[PDB]
Symmetry: C3
Subunit: 445 residues, 3 copies
């Protein structure tokens, strides 16, 4: 809906609210088959140029098959094993006798079909390429006589086009040990992906979500290689199921908060930690510390709970009262006052320290705001760029309302002499405990 922001002058942090999250909680697996032709090499008296072209492209087909075979003889472990049991379980059933034969029978007359496998799983199977019909109908009469028949030039071109997708799939499955992500258009065309979404047990509102964000769905999908057996190449595509929909989400931005004394060696700094994406999830908050685990489109966020930490909902109270006893808000300390800026969703935090020249400009008016020393913020309303030293950042021109929440910077409530200035993973109450221990050591002395 309406994206809003709140800059907290006291902690040098901003919160971008109003995003609707879609969290991955399940997987929907589907079998993608390619019917191949078991045609060991055949040699006939051949010289005409069309026959040579056919045997060359046919040799590229034979090698793609032996290569997928050496990929499946020994399958190297991947860093994705913790996210693919759903699909590996389908591949293990397919290796059973008769299971590849069932899908070969269901897709005998149609391209798409639901097939009830062993393990009681009603999976949706599909056949995106048919090389067995093409090689056996158009090519075998051409290489399985005493002397080769002459194929027309249209067949030579059509076979290079059809065989291409097999080769590109073989290239991707080979360089990535059978597990590819994102799922490319070679693994699944956009036309095949949307029809696959349409044939899923999800709400009509959920099909609209995935169909309008196909690139994000591709980036949160996996393609797993199964088996080459009985003239069938099968591989599993693991598509995301978003069990959490339209959940409130926000993004925390933090920047160093130092004191602005003029004598070096007398300044202390604090920075809030755990910046990133937060989403309400099942009575708790799902936090995403890595930056690439959440894709954003407009007001919408797509996260994977695979790379999240589960925190109590009281973690949001670091945003309204950082000194609040229900949650131990985390900070880091240092004496490292280098100027920097963070481009938020609707503005910019600027931490200006020392002699750094910090400013905010409009493209036609020029410099419209000069930051003094400390931590400050400017909205995107009327601002295009922000300069810190020799670096120019661009402000997001997204529509929304910014709110500047005035307050005394909390770094000023701390005595420099007893401050712990090198904590790398501390907490507000931890630092206070270090101050009580440094104050007991001076009373005693």
């Amino acid at each position: 809906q309406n994206i809003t922001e709140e800059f907290y002058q006291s902690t040098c942090s901003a919160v971008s609210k109003g995003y609707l999250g879609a969290l991955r909680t399940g997987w929907y697996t589907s079998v993608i088959t390619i019917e191949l032709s078991n045609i060991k090499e055949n040699k006939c008296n051949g010289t005409d140029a069309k026959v040579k072209l056919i045997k060359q492209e046919l040799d590229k087909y034979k090698n793609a098959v032996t290569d997928l075979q050496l990929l499946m003889q020994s399958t190297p472990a991947t860093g994705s094993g913790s996210a693919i049991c759903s699909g590996v379980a389908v591949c293990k059933v397919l290796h059973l006798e008769g299971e590849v034969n069932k899908i070969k029978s269901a897709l005998l007359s149609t391209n798409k079909a639901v097939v009830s496998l062993s393990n009681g799983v009603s999976v949706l199977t599909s056949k995106v390429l048919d090389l067995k019909n093409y090689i056996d109908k158009q090519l075998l009469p051409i290489v399985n006589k005493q002397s080769c028949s002459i194929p027309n030039i249209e067949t030579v071109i059509e076979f290079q086009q059809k065989n291409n997708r097999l080769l590109e799939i073989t290239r991707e499955f080979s360089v990535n040990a059978g597990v590819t992500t994102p799922v490319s258009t070679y693994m699944l065309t956009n036309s095949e992906l949307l029809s696959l979404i349409n044939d899923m047990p999800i709400t009509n509102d959920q099909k609209k979500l995935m169909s309008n964000n196909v690139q994000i769905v591709r980036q949160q999908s996996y393609s797993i290689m199964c088996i080459i057996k009985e003239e069938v190449l099968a591989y599993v595509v693991q598509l995301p199921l978003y069990g959490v929909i339209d959940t409130p989400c926000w993004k925390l931005h933090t920047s160093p908060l130092c004191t602005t004394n003029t004598k070096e060696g007398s300044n202390i700094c604090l920075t809030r930690t755990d910046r990133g994406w937060y989403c309400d999830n099942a009575g708790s908050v799902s936090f995403f510390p890595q930056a690439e685990t959440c894709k954003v489109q407009s007001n919408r966020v797509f996260c994977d709970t695979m790379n999240s930490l589960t925190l109590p909902s009281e973690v949001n109270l670091c945003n309204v009262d950082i000194f609040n006893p229900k949650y131990d808000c985390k900070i880091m300390t240092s004496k490292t006052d280098v100027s920097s800026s963070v481009i938020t969703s609707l503005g910019a935090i600027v931490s200006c320290y020392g002699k750094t020249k910090c400013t905010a400009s409009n493209k036609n008016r020029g410099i419209i705001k000069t930051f003094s020393n400390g931590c400050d913020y400017v909205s995107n309303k009327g601002v295009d760029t922000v300069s810190v030293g020799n670096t120019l950042y661009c402000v997001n021109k997204q529509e929304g309302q910014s709110l500047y929440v005035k307050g005394e910077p909390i770094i000023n409530f701390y005595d420099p002499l007893v401050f712990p200035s090198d904590e790398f993973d501390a907490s507000i109450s931890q630092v206070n405990e270090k101050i009580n221990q440094s104050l007991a050591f001076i009373r005693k002395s």
Copy 2:
């Protein structure tokens, strides 16, 4: 010019000087257009193989267009938004009525043309592919009658070649949400890029710089997707403008500096921080902490100020006097004495501790130097490899002069009992303050 190095035995660090830097300070945007053909699907009585091949490749063209359309209906946010306002501003003008019509008129007779847009911007527009002329002249008489005309086999091949670039551009813009970097040869051929450089408002010496380093220019460029409207596919290429040229640059190398006592638990360590690239920039120093933000060719360095910190020029004094009061030189402390090596531009720093077997060899002479415990350095003059434990590093055979600056290791000026051994972001004066506080706690006790 002449690359030189200075190893500082006192701080276990080396500085590689003599590089000439080219820092990105601006962007030069250009519009790249592809004229497409609005030919909704047309069906005629067709069976001949050439007609089938044409309709298949034509179907691949129709899907590439609907896919670029679903990419532009909802454009996902990227981590590059802080670096692309220059190009997003051109796309927003193109969405105005009449603006795509202007560039369609300027490139009616020629491929390249400067076009004055709204917003007073004289951008250089180009038309690298013409599918509207080819489909409407060679293909439409073939599918827009009662029965399809038979196209010759040369047309079938020429259309698969021309249509290919559209498909590869669609693949890259789709998997990357409309923003690609580096800019591939599909987005812009080397022939098109060099002619685009030649037609820029830069010095003759600056065109020679970018033309001789096209791969680095590609790696520091962005390709942004604009709009598909009125049979025109437009996308913006953002090329770097190096406002800083031939500026002095240097690279700092640091390695842990420990004491070499024989009893474990009695050794302390120090390591200089902020290793990376430094360049003189507008009265200050631009520091690049990330390693991949600066590309090196010979004596030349290409950095992006987007990922830099602006530091006072006194930061260079950590290299000549680390105990110097004008700048608080930063260090890290530990008791972690593991042997390691750093390959510098003209030699190697070796931090040898414990029982580790450290050496420097020549390919035909063998081991020519055995390092004892502590931090040392060897030039590339006569040295090919350096071995630390079970690891063999290769020495850069670049020509230059190395200078070994002798001095007492500063770790020896510190008493172990009161040393702070676990600081992760400290400073020379900070550590001295921790020593004064630990010395007041023992006087008191």
Copy 3:
């Protein structure tokens, strides 16, 4: 052989044993040549469509050559220079007069041949593509008369197929500054790679190792561009030599170990550091801290000593007695008790703290184990998934024996009041020294 595991309840860590390692200790270089045709552009009266197609593909060949030339005029430095001297040394010899002429003579009649170069190096050279013979025999009579001869349509297609590999090689060498890794099938086909392995000075058991793990070999190989000179395009492929074979290897898994008091602010935490792969190597242990430097297939591990640290073999004693004086086992401390899990090779460590809902389920039985607060472990025998908060991890279904080594968690031997709770790189004896210093400051007070 048999993969086994040991979970140590006292330190919240697990060790996966039984892997056989293959460590890279050497390089085997090979020259890959492509004979090109020096045919500056030639123009004849041309209009027929086959001639146009030939000149278009020929123009793509001419540009691929000028592009490889601008790549070799100025070669940008790469982060791989410390691992490629073996191949750069072959390129420097090839630039000598007569050296490219020798390999051009040895591969005049055959595709593969061993060639003794200057520098006494008996390298294996190969010629994977012949464009000089094809252009000069099939194309030059077509563009080097007064008017162009008409080539048959088979030649037009065969030239687009042959020229393709040159263009794909030019694309990869251009975007990566002459050094590519992994080595793609365009640089070296699987058929060419296996024949290259077969012709190497290695044991019959070592050829079987590399031939059965070609994708891992590709990922641990480099392709380096040499020179374009006298109608010859040469580039060096650096293949790994595994000097260490069948060496014992193990993987250490660590998870935070906190106390489980009910009052926040009274809990302390410890986590073992240096998680990753360890292999016995030449009387010491080769440790691999980065996760991507070791590829695993079944019981087998493939590491590169380029990114390893050499540690004494006593480092294994942190696994049986962490309080052991022969090695100072490393830990990190905090007060950061967030629940998490680590999927091991044969089970899962679960660090459950606070109100987090931690469990282990079987697909058909449901929740079979509920973890209480502290650090615990569950084997893969009967367990499919493990849930921590809102995150579901998948358990590896690999066969092996797990051993739960019971013991009191060592975090309970520490008094909270004097514990150092913010160390980021500490050691067991270091922390004890901080406790002795905090105990002297309270006796004194």
